[PDB]
Amino acid sequence: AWPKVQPEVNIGVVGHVDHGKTTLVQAITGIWTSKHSEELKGMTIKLGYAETNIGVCESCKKPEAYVTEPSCKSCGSDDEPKFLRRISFIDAPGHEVLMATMLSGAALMDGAILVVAANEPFPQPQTREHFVALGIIGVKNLIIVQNKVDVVSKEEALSQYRQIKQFTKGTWAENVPIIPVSALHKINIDSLIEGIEEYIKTPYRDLSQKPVMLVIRSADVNAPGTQFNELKGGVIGGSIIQGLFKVDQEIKVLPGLRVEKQGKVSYEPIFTKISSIAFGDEEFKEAKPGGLVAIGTYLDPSLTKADNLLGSIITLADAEVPVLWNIRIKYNLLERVVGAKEMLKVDPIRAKETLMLSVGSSTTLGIVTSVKKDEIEVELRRPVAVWSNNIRTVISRQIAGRWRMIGWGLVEI
Ligand SMILES: Nc1nc2c(ncn2[C@@H]2O[C@H](COP(=O)(O)OP(=O)(O)CP(=O)(O)O)[C@@H](O)[C@H]2O)c(=O)[nH]1
Ligand code: NA
Ligand code: NA
Ligand code: NA
Secondary structure, three states: OOOOOOOOOEEEEEEOOOOOHHHHHHHHHOOOOOOOOOOOOOOOOOEEEEEEEEEEOOOOOOOOOEEOOOOOHHHOOOOOOEEEEEEEEEEOOOOHHHHHHHHHHHOOOOEEEEEEEOOOOOOOHHHHHHHHHHHHHOOOOEEEEEEOOOOOOHHHHHHHHHHHHHHHOOOOOOOOOEEEOEOOOOEOHHHHHHHHHHHOOOOOOOOOOOOEEEEOOHHHEEOOOOOOOOOOOOEEEEEEEEOOEEOOOEEEEEEEEEEEEOOEEEEEEEEEEEEEEEEOOEEEOEEOOOOOEEEEEOOOHHHHOOOOEEEEEEEEOOOOOOEEEEEEEEEEEOOOOOOOOOOOOOOOOOOOOEEEEEEOOEEEEEEEEEEOOOEEEEEEEEEEEOOOOOEEEEEEEEEOOEEEEEEEEEEEO
16 A cells, blocks of 8 residues: 655646646546636636645556556556655646736745647747746746647647747746646646656755745635644644644744734734644644645634734744835846736836735735835835745736736845
8 A cells, every 4th residue: 555645746737727727637636626617606716736646667668657546457567556756736727817826826836837728829828927937936847738639630739839849949948848638538647747757856855944834825725635624723724835844833823913903003923833734634743845734723713714814824933034014125027018918018116106026825015115226125015924035026016907927036134
C-alpha cells in the first residue's frame, strides 16, 4: 500500500476562460473541483483544489508506466508501482473579472500548467495575462498544455504549436514544453504526468525559516477532498510557504480581528494553538510547504468564519511580523495592459489614485501618497502583514470598470 503523506508541491492550473482547466484537473486527479451545474445566480469564482498520488511501474513502457493509483495491471506488471510523490493542484478561474483570485492562488504555486485550447486563436487575453503574471511572480516551472486536441486535426494542432514556440521564443519560457492532451476524453494524460515529474520538481524547502502560512478563506476555495472537522474549534485553511508547523504549537492570526474602539478602527491579532493538522482526509503531526492544509484551532467557529477576521497569514505566536497601514514599494510597470481585449498602454503611477495590491494571498486597496521613479508609498485601506523583506506584490489599476494588472514590485520595510 502507498504511504499516506502530505502533498509536497502545488501546481497551478491557469489559462483563458473555458479552455478546460477544471476538466484537466479532473483528468489527472479524478476530482471535479467546481460545482458546475449552476453557481450563484456565469462562471466559477472560487479556486479549485485537488490532490493525487503519483507513481511509476518500474519495468513498463513510458510514459504509460506513470500512474495516479497503486496499480500496474495496465502495463502487464503484477507488482505495485513505485510511489514517487503526492501533488496538489490550484485551479484558478479564467474570467477576466477574477484576476485578483488568480493572483491570490499564484502565491501558493510551486509550478504551473498553462492550459491553451487547441480550437481557439492563440493567444487569448487571459492566456497572455496569466502567463505574464506567472513570470512576474516567479512561477517559472511551467508546462504549457495544449488541451482539446480532439477537436482539431493533427495539422491544426501543430500549427498552433509553432505559434506558441514563437511566442515563448526570446522570453524566460523559451524552453517550456508543450504537451497536447484531451482533458475531457482523457487522451495523452500519461505524457502530462511524465512532464510534471520532469519539469515541475519539488522545490528545496528551507525548513528552518520562520513558519509562515498564507490563509485561504473557506468561501474562496472548493476543496472536495478536504473537510472542516470543527469539534475542537474553528479550522483555518491555507498553504505553508516557509518553515513548518506542528500540533500543539502556539500561533497567531494576522492582521487579526477588526475592532472599532471609540470610532478608531484597529486589527487585534488572534492567538490560539494548533489542535490538529489535516491534508485531505488524513491527520498529521506536522505540516510543511505543499498542499492546502487545514489547521485545526481551539477558536470558536463563529470567529474563524467572521468577515471581520482579517486572517491573511498565520505564524508562531512569538514571531516578529509587522502589520503596516502604510507601505513603500519598489515597483516596476508593465509596458502594456496585457489582460484586455485590446492591449492598451499603461500610464505612469500618479499620486492620490487608488491601486489594488496583491500581497501573499490577500488583496488590498490603497491610496498613492508618494510617487518616484522606482518607488511608491501607499496609504492602505486595511493593513497587511509583512513577514519578510523580499515579498512580491502585484499592482492593479481599475480600467473600464475592470481591475487590470499593470505592474509589480517589492514591499520594502
Ligand atoms: N472537446 C473537448 N472539450 C473540452 C476539453 N476539456 C474541456 N472541454 C470542455 O470545455 C468546457 C469548459 O471546460 P472547463 O474545464 O470547465 O473549463 P474551465 O477553464 O475550468 C472554465 P473557467 O475559465 O471559468 O475556470 C466544458 O464544456 C468542457 O467539457 C477537451 O479536452 N476536449
Ligand atoms: Na489519484
Ligand atoms: Na511559489
Ligand atoms: Na487532433
